[PDB]
Amino acid sequence: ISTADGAQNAIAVVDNALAAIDAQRADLAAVQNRFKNTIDNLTNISENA
Amino acid sequence: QVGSNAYETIDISLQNASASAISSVASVDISTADGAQNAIAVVDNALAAIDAQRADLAAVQNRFKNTIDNLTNISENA
Amino acid sequence: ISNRLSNQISGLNVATRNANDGISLAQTAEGALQQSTNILQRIRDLALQSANGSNSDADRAALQKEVAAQQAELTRISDTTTFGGRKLLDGSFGTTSFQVGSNAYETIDISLQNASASAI
Amino acid sequence: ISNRLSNQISGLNVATRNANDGISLAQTAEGALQQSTNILQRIRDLALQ
Amino acid sequence: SANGSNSDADRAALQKEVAAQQAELTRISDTTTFGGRKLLDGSFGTTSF
Amino acid sequence: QVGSNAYETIDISLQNASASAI
Amino acid sequence: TNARSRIKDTDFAAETAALSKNQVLQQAGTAILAQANQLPQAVLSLLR
Amino acid sequence: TNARSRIKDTDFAAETAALSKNQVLQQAGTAILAQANQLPQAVLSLLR
Amino acid sequence: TNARSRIKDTDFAAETAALSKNQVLQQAGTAILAQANQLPQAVLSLLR
Amino acid sequence: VNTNIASLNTQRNLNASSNDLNTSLQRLTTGYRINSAKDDAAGLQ
Amino acid sequence: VNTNIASLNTQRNLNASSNDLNTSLQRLTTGYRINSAKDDAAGLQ
């Protein structure tokens, strides 16, 4: 950071990359939401079977 | 800086010098009458430059004061 | 019928929340404008000061600088309101439409002022 | 969205504080200049003397 | 790290602070060995549950 | 100026000179 | 000095609110735990 | 000099009233906060 | 200015009463909820 | 009955109450019955 | 609700109040409505 011109650009760095992170976290959102349904569903299948 | 984004800053323009650039206040060496009178002409002009500098500060913390009441209301409602 | 009811209900809970975030958006916008008004209040204060005893305040020059500073504020406040990285009111905001129910095109168009800095 | 909000909020609290220290800076500068003006007032007092 | 724009000389300390946090983004990047084949650092091979 | 609106002012007419014009 | 306070001088008229919030959380999560630790008790007492 | 006072000389016989108003506000908003910070306390103490 | 207050200046000597009423409602409906959420508990605990 | 609680209607009322409460407190802080907010924009204007 | 307190808005107003308060006291000490500070720099000048 130490130079001011790098402080400001630093913010531009972290912002973009943080968006990539929370995209990754949201990828996980879809994945265990997908799981949770999948297992309620699978579980009802193995039930009625 | 007064917000969260880059280059969101208030440039300030402190007078580069006070001692020898207020020609100079230190140049004058009053002792002769003809230098007394011209001395007044020196100090007058330079003093105007000072109180221009002080008034520059007027704009700057007036600018700050608003800016922070405003910023503060933003961070509020956010 | 119930499947349609659950459809309606939980959809409208989400739409409620979208509306609440919208309430907050318009709130933050309101705050920004309140303070624009404090400035403009000061601008009349300074314009009237700038009678100058009609010509006696030579240091209107300082006032001019004061004015310039406040003018720059009406750019900073105009920027800096990035609720979304797509900030409120400066430049070009695109007149968005907050949904408040569960059906399509069931939305509240809002008309934020296109600009604050150079268009007041 | 909230992660972006917390980003904004706490960042702007720090920026508020940076601004407040700036207010103090310009205040101290102002005091120094006030007293420069007392001197210069005296300098006209002495030039006229 | 605006630093009062140049007034915090002890950005140097902040730089050290930054470095420490940067090292954290390596430690958290490592240390997640669910399987000895840890989650997300380096190269994870896009597995299929 | 003595109010808040534009051109709301009191013109004053100080004598242009005192020395050589009295 | 005024600067030194703007640096240090907590606006504790706000931090009081923060304080209550923390005390409040201690209390609440605690009561939640007093409830939570009753769960397994019930589970087994009934399945038996 | 009389001008210099019309510029500087605060008509503090008015600013006293302004002063009281500010002191008054400090007091009032404070007491409001002493009330306000009791709200969340009540909320959780009851829902638990 | 007097007009400006007749517009803005809350007759808070009335709004205090309104204030109490709101605080009061927070309290009351809360206690009602502390009672209300006990209903289903009882229903099943007994039918079982 | 257990599937839900009609008494959540109570909750709704309280939400309204708390909204009013907060606004009142704002008005009591500043002494301005018209908040700087838009509310009653006529008198504000 | 507990996650935060909207009534911190009250706090903000008081900060402004205290600022005004201090400045008034300064003006009451010296008798100078224009502080030696920059404020109202025109009349100061």
Author numbering:
A (entry chain L): 392 to 440
B (entry chain K): 148 to 169, 385 to 440
C (entry chain A): 50 to 169
D (entry chain K): 50 to 98
E (entry chain L): 99 to 147
F (entry chain W): 148 to 169
G (entry chain U), H (entry chain g), I (entry chain W): 441 to 488
J (entry chain W), K (entry chain g): 5 to 49
Lines from the paper:
The “short” state results from a protofilament having a right-handed inclination (the R-state), while the “long” state results from a protofilament having a left-handed inclination (the L-state). To reconstruct filaments at high resolution, all protofilaments must be “locked” into the same state, either L- or R-type, producing straightened filaments that lead to non-motile bacteria.
Next, we analyzed flagellar filaments from the Gram-negative bacterium Pseudomonas aeruginosa to compare with a Gram-negative species. Since the D0 and D1 domains of P. aeruginosa and S. enterica share a high degree of sequence identity (55%), we tested the conserved L- and R-type mutations characterized in S. enterica (G426A and A449V, respectively), which correspond to G420A and A443V in P. aeruginosa, respectively. We found that these mutations also generate straightened filaments in this organism. Filaments from these two FliC mutants of P. aeruginosa were sheared off the bacteria, concentrated, plunge-frozen and cryo-EM imaged. Each mutation results in L- and R-type straight filaments as expected, which suggests that the D0/D1 architecture is indeed conserved between P. aeruginosa and S. enterica. That we could reach such a resolution for D0 and D1 confirms that the perturbation is entirely limited to the outer D2/D3 domains, as previously suggested from lower resolution studies of other bacteria. From our structures, in P. aeruginosa the D3 domain extends along the 11-start and forms a dimer with the D2 domain of another subunit; while in S. enterica, the D3 domain extends from the filament and does not interact with other subunits.
